Design a protein around this ligand. Sequence first.
Ligand code: NI
Length: 341
Amino acid sequence: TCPFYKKIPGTGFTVDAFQYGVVEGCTAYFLTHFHSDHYAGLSKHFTFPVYCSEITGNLLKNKLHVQEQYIHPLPLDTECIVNGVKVVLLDANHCPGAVMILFYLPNGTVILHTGDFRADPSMERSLLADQKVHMLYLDTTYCSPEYTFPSQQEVIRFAINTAFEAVTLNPHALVVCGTYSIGKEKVFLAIADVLGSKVGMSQEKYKTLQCLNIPEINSLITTDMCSSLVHLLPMMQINFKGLQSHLKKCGGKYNQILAFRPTGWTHSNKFTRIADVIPQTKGNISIYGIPYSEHSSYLEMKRFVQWLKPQKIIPTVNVGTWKSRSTMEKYFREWKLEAGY
Ligand code: NI
């Protein structure tokens, strides 16, 4: 059964609610982004309207085979009428095609559902600036002060300079980057660009990348693994066993692997600056864990919410324990008292 925080009161609408069968009263199902926890239950057999971004729509059609007649893509930053209700989609600064959704309820209430997001000051100059929001359904993934990490730009700077230095010292090194879903594409694209290489990968990953509207993509990726010195592999294979095995397959073309595992936050963020990160090493294989986040840090989230000044907040992540829920409610009250709303 569909939980309350995925329902939009006073509409026939649900958000990210595909794993509960036919939801009673739901006339339209919104999908914020193409990550499996959110799309769970969609397939070629789905026969209700789905509303989403153009990119999300390409992925529904090609990867899950959802029939065309049921995919309703909407342009961003544009007031749209869906089943008699005004809605807008805003960029979530998450993975490709991820949106936030503003709902203008018939009774005068305004609701923002962030989906998954990484808050940014640039959001303070979207169509959010124009008016008041009564209810905020908030991505609270890292809603605690210990959750600190660098900007995406600094993390990419570290990876580019690390990769360039290694391959310039040894032209026979191979670079590997881990992946398990869309998002974080800048990691492997930035490294391949500095090295003058295309990124090699499986046919299934190439297919997924081809759905994402990235400019010049045909120039950047390839399924010919042999022509490429940046390879993508599933995240599970980024370990000393999996990388040893991979190196054997390359036919004595390479004599070293430098590999990256983009993670979210890890506890080594509590002690170590990005500059000071070191790899794990075994023989001719090194592995760097790098904290590239597509979710708000604590400070980024607090800034957004204190700017928005919502009347009520409903968390959508970490809602399963009493301790979590209590902790998040304490932070929301501090924020409100500090800012005066
Ligand atoms: Ni996500």
